[PDB]
Amino acid sequence: MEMEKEFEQIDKSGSWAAIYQDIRHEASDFPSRVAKLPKNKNRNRYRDVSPFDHSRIKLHQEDNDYINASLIKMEEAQRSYILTQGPLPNTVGHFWEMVWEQKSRGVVMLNRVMEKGSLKCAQYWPQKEEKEMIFEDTNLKLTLISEDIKSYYTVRQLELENLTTQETREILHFHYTTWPDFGVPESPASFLNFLFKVRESGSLSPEHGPVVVHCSAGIGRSGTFCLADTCLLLMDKRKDPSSVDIKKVLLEMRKFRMGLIQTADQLRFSYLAVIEGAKFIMGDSSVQDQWKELSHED
């Protein structure tokens, strides 16, 4: 595995910050004019994180179609993702409107509601079966059907009902609950365990709309998730770990949303996750059971 040797050269030489800065310098810059319109200021969580115009998700709403969300379309892998920010109190209805309109089957949440003593996301799903949520502005109803709480992630089964048409859909919410407040996980085991649980659910499959992935800004942890998934899929499709250049894939995803992978440590962690996951892709089926074990899921 040449990326495993690239990893060792970079790690041995302590060069992660340098490689990361090079990625930042080569990354695309496209206009984000709609995000910056004054009428959309209260729809953005961070003033410096905006979707590009060319890849932004549009709400089917005549008044204002804007949500801070981007479509990442990885053509060779046949995988697409919607990356978005953690919803704001005033955008929770827009968030679920997007899920409905885009026909998503899964929502992947990589942050906690409170981190570092501050709110990173609105509580946008119900906490109890008998207390459903109604989003009056977008005419949707959301019910918690069941919740499976594990040590490293929670999976929830939600029912989303379009009140205008009486149609309902089941949505799976995958909530990775153990990313540390600072830095990255020391081992990728539980994250890979988590990624494969999302895969197994059918949420990433092309018969559904794109999975919705978010953290607080929708670029750091979210970027690590998509980067790992796409790199492992490409290695699967070529069955060749050495034909996959993580840096090139990351630059191709940065054509669709700015800033993906925020720190050099997230970049290092992305390499580690792909290197370890490649053991499963290349036919060592048993490693998945070791991840579950090492993840201490129970």
Side-chain angles (χ1 to χ4, degrees), residues 1-61 63-298:
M1 208 183 314
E2 79 94 52
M3 97 180 82
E4 183 167 13
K5 257 59 87 196
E6 185 171 276
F7 181 91
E8 287 193 2
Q9 288 174 319
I10 300 166
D11 224 30
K12 198 188 304 185
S13 62
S15 310
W16 286 107
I19 299 306
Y20 183 64
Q21 272 295 321
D22 284 337
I23 287 173
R24 289 175 98 256
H25 292 150
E26 284 298 325
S28 302
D29 192 15
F30 294 109
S32 51
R33 301 181 183 114
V34 178
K36 300 275 78 170
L37 295 172
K39 62 165 174 161
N40 290 327
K41 190 178 185 188
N42 64 3
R43 291 181 178 212
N44 292 313
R45 178 173 289 281
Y46 298 105
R47 196 168 58 80
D48 58 331
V49 180
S50 296
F52 300 138
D53 296 325
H54 78 85
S55 55
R56 74 184 180 96
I57 298 296
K58 304 178 180 190
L59 301 174
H60 309 163
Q61 236 176 346
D63 176 51
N64 184 346
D65 66 11
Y66 177 78
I67 182 167
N68 191 319
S70 307
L71 182 63
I72 298 9
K73 197 161 218 73
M74 301 303 292
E75 231 181 327
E76 185 188 355
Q78 288 156 214
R79 208 90 117 189
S80 59
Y81 314 90
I82 289 166
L83 268 60
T84 189
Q85 67 185 16
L88 298 154
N90 56 307
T91 67
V92 287
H94 306 157
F95 177 89
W96 286 114
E97 175 182 1
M98 174 178 71
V99 168
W100 181 272
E101 289 171 356
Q102 299 298 316
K103 298 187 164 54
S104 313
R105 170 66 167 144
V107 175
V108 175
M109 172 170 182
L110 300 166
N111 65 291
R112 291 175 293 289
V113 167
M114 179 171 286
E115 289 177 15
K116 297 181 185 173
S118 297
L119 293 170
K120 297 298 180 196
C121 191
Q123 176 67 48
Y124 64 87
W125 71 94
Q127 312 233 248
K128 286 175 191 170
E129 285 89 337
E130 64 274 25
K131 292 189 169 330
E132 69 274 12
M133 294 176 77
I134 292 161
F135 303 104
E136 297 206 340
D137 59 335
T138 54
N139 211 233
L140 294 163
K141 176 174 92 175
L142 185 66
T143 305
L144 177 68
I145 300 302
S146 69
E147 177 172 73
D148 190 8
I149 296 184
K150 306 300 190 191
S151 53
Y152 283 85
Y153 58 93
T154 295
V155 181
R156 307 176 177 98
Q157 183 192 345
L158 307 170
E159 176 193 270
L160 186 58
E161 181 179 345
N162 187 327
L163 293 169
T164 302
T165 68
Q166 297 286 59
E167 193 180 330
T168 66
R169 286 181 204 156
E170 177 183 81
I171 304 299
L172 296 174
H173 190 243
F174 293 95
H175 189 185
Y176 186 75
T177 55
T178 53
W179 197 290
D181 269 17
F182 293 97
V184 299
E186 188 157 345
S187 146
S190 64
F191 185 79
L192 288 166
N193 187 57
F194 175 80
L195 167 67
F196 276 94
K197 297 268 85 85
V198 179
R199 282 187 169 199
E200 288 183 355
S201 77
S203 295
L204 301 171
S205 300
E207 61 263 44
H208 299 296
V211 72
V212 174
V213 183
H214 78 87
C215 46
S216 190
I219 60 174
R221 291 177 208 176
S222 294
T224 300
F225 182 88
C226 300
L227 181 59
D229 182 51
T230 286
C231 285
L232 287 171
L233 193 58
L234 289 175
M235 297 177 70
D236 224 354
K237 199 189 209 89
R238 320 171 175 174
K239 286 292 183 176
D240 191 356
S242 70
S243 68
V244 178
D245 184 340
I246 293 187
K247 304 178 297 306
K248 211 166 296 191
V249 177
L250 177 54
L251 285 171
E252 173 77 26
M253 284 184 184
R254 274 189 176 217
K255 295 174 176 178
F256 298 96
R257 186 170 176 83
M258 59 173 63
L260 303 184
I261 305 296
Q262 296 182 278
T263 69
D265 274 308
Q266 283 173 1
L267 181 62
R268 181 177 186 278
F269 180 78
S270 294
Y271 271 75
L272 219 49
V274 172
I275 288 162
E276 286 300 307
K279 301 177 185 178
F280 179 83
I281 295 321
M282 294 306 301
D284 183 2
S285 40
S286 78
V287 302
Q288 180 166 7
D289 296 290
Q290 291 162 273
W291 297 339
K292 181 190 158 194
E293 283 275 276
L294 296 172
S295 79
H296 300 300
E297 171 175 293
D298 297 323

